[PDB]
Write an enzyme that holds these catalytic residues in place. Structure first.
Site, PDB file in Angstrom:
ATOM      1  N   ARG A  94      -6.733   2.777   3.497  1.00 45.76           N
ATOM      2  CA  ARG A  94      -7.490   1.531   3.391  1.00 45.76           C
ATOM      3  C   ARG A  94      -6.707   0.279   3.806  1.00 45.76           C
ATOM      4  NH1 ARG A  94     -12.357   2.625   1.860  1.00 45.76           N
ATOM      5  NH2 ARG A  94     -12.811   0.389   1.524  1.00 45.76           N
ATOM      6  N   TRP A 102     -11.588  12.480  -1.512  1.00 43.93           N
ATOM      7  CA  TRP A 102     -10.180  12.347  -1.143  1.00 43.93           C
ATOM      8  C   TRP A 102      -9.211  12.778  -2.233  1.00 43.93           C
ATOM      9  CZ3 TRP A 102     -10.037  11.913   3.836  1.00 43.93           C
ATOM     10  CH2 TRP A 102     -11.022  11.177   4.497  1.00 43.93           C
ATOM     11  N   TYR A 131       0.839  -1.194   0.000  1.00 47.88           N
ATOM     12  CA  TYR A 131       0.000   0.000   0.000  1.00 47.88           C
ATOM     13  C   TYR A 131       0.878   1.249   0.000  1.00 47.88           C
ATOM     14  CZ  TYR A 131      -4.125   2.886   1.231  1.00 47.88           C
ATOM     15  OH  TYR A 131      -5.141   3.799   1.240  1.00 47.88           O
TER      16      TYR A 131
HETATM   17  N1  LIG Z   1     -12.482  -0.513  -2.133  1.00 42.37           N
HETATM   18  C1  LIG Z   1     -11.148  -0.866  -2.591  1.00 42.37           C
HETATM   19  C2  LIG Z   1     -10.500   0.389  -3.144  1.00 42.37           C
HETATM   20  C3  LIG Z   1      -9.124   0.169  -3.764  1.00 42.37           C
HETATM   21  C4  LIG Z   1      -8.627   1.499  -4.297  1.00 42.37           C
HETATM   22  O1  LIG Z   1      -9.482   2.315  -5.074  1.00 42.37           O
HETATM   23  N2  LIG Z   1      -7.377   1.853  -3.995  1.00 42.37           N
HETATM   24  C5  LIG Z   1      -6.845   3.157  -4.355  1.00 42.37           C
HETATM   25  C6  LIG Z   1      -6.004   3.753  -3.224  1.00 42.37           C
HETATM   26  S1  LIG Z   1      -6.940   4.055  -1.699  1.00 42.37           S
HETATM   27  C7  LIG Z   1      -5.996   3.061  -5.590  1.00 42.37           C
HETATM   28  O2  LIG Z   1      -5.249   1.904  -5.841  1.00 42.37           O
HETATM   29  N3  LIG Z   1      -5.980   4.122  -6.386  1.00 42.37           N
HETATM   30  C8  LIG Z   1      -4.849   4.407  -7.259  1.00 42.37           C
HETATM   31  C9  LIG Z   1      -5.234   4.020  -8.664  1.00 42.37           C
HETATM   32  O3  LIG Z   1      -6.386   3.546  -8.865  1.00 42.37           O
HETATM   33  O4  LIG Z   1      -4.431   4.174  -9.616  1.00 42.37           O
HETATM   34  C10 LIG Z   1     -10.358  -1.399  -1.429  1.00 42.37           C
HETATM   35  O5  LIG Z   1     -10.739  -1.108  -0.276  1.00 42.37           O
HETATM   36  O6  LIG Z   1      -9.344  -2.128  -1.603  1.00 42.37           O
END
Ligand SMILES: N[C@@H](CCC(=O)N[C@@H](CS)C(=O)NCC(=O)O)C(=O)O
Ligand SMILES: N[C@@H](CCC(=O)N[C@@H](CS)C(=O)NCC(=O)O)C(=O)O
Ligand SMILES: O=C(O)c1cnn(-c2ccccc2)c1
Lengths: 198, 198
Positions: free
Chosen positions: A13, A103, A7
């Site tokens: 998360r 966010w 992460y």
């Molecule tokens: N609901 C999913 C959400 C996963 C998610 O949208 N992660 C985000 C970060 S909080 C992410 O990887 N965003 C960066 C991207 O999509 O490139 C979980 O809880 O794992």
């Protein structure tokens, strides 16, 4: 098992998973990446999102799905299938509300306005619902701690960053936060975890 | 036990519960309410959201929490601890996307716009990810049907209402929908259910 959690350098998360590992005394690699290393990592992922958990080389995704997987057959899951339902429901209710926050909003003023609206209207509503659901009980569900209490503490920690007085009229919810934070495995983790805003 | 499901007169978020009851051959009261009567019922609910499932003398809430409860220790849950995690993760991926839709937006212009944006710019990527994930396998997880297949069929049905061409380049995903719709209990429910837009 050989566990590796991936992460960003933040609670976010992944924190619920980190609390669970700590509580269950399960060893894992807390791999935190910086933005520069994300494009390459992202391209290897079936769904392109983090967190992911690698278990003996097999990749799992979806933070809450992983949290549930880790608590299975433990008391942290809920004592009966019915209690497990209540646990899942409280977790979903908290998650739904946290998902309302912009966010990633790039316009700082819009972000400020939206945060203030959610924290002035919606948050106090949810807190009243949460407070009355808990009542004078020890924990959110049943008579022992569950990962729902953990998620409450985690979500509220982030909400308090933006509205420090959010729980000023909910001493029962403050007490729940203190009870979770006081669990030795949790207290230990909170002390040693990287300090981040989110 | 006696089961009473309460929701609007639509598939929406109650549909996954309805498929599960159908598949497991469990009788239940399918209570559908008019919007005009919602504010009144909403005021008596611990968290003010539907669907709710009344079992004996308790109320259950959160559609996926309820779905998880009903499928626990049934053939609709994954076949291993890890498969259960993938079932939960695929459901959450689909839910994360369906939750982006401003279903309750009052301004028609704003609503249509965001819908169009999500369907045109985001939905095809989800389809790409799901197609690759499924690969050449029969079901989304493991060797047999799970409630993740049900949720895929349900979510895709609604998406197709707004974007009929969404799966023109994904024959394997069209085949999966067809397999789910061919399951006898599901087929029977699809034939007899109230026919609504959403
Ligand atoms: N609901 C999913 C959400 C996963 C998610 O949208 N992660 C985000 C970060 S909080 C992410 O990887 N965003 C960066 C991207 O999509 O490139 C979980 O809880 O794992
Ligand atoms: N994550 C929840 C969503 C619950 C929800 O937002 N339901 C809507 C209808 S689909 C609702 O009760 N909205 C009416 C309102 O909140 O006033 C679930 O899966 O049940
Ligand atoms: O709230 C609504 O009107 C609505 C309609 N469909 N859905 C929905 C949401 C998630 C998954 C399937 C359907 C919600």
């Amino acid at each position: 098992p050989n566990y590796k959690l991936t992460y960003f350098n933040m609670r976010g998360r992944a924190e619920i998973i980190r609390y669970i590992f700590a509580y269950l005394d399960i060893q894992y690699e807390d791999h935190r990446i910086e933005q520069a290393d994300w494009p390459e990592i992202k391209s290897t992922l079936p769904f392109g999102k983090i967190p992911i958990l690698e278990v003996d080389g097999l990749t799992l995704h979806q933070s809450l799905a992983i949290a549930r997987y880790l608590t299975k057959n433990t008391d942290l899951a809920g004592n009966t299938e019915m209690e497990q339902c209540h646990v899942d429901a409280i977790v979903d209710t908290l998650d739904d509300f946290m998902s309302c926050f912009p966010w990633a909003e790039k316009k700082q003023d819009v972000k400020e306005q939206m945060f203030n609206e959610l924290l002035t209207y919606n948050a106090p509503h949810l807190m009243q619902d949460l407070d009355t659901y808990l009542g004078g009980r020890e924990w959110l569900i049943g008579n022992s701690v569950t990962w729902a209490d953990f998620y409450w503490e985690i979500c509220s920690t982030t909400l308090l960053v933006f509205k420090p007085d959010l729980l000023d009229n909910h001493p029962r919810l403050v007490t729940l936060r203190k009870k979770v934070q006081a669990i030795p495995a949790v207290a230990n983790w909170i002390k040693r975890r990287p300090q981040t805003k989110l």
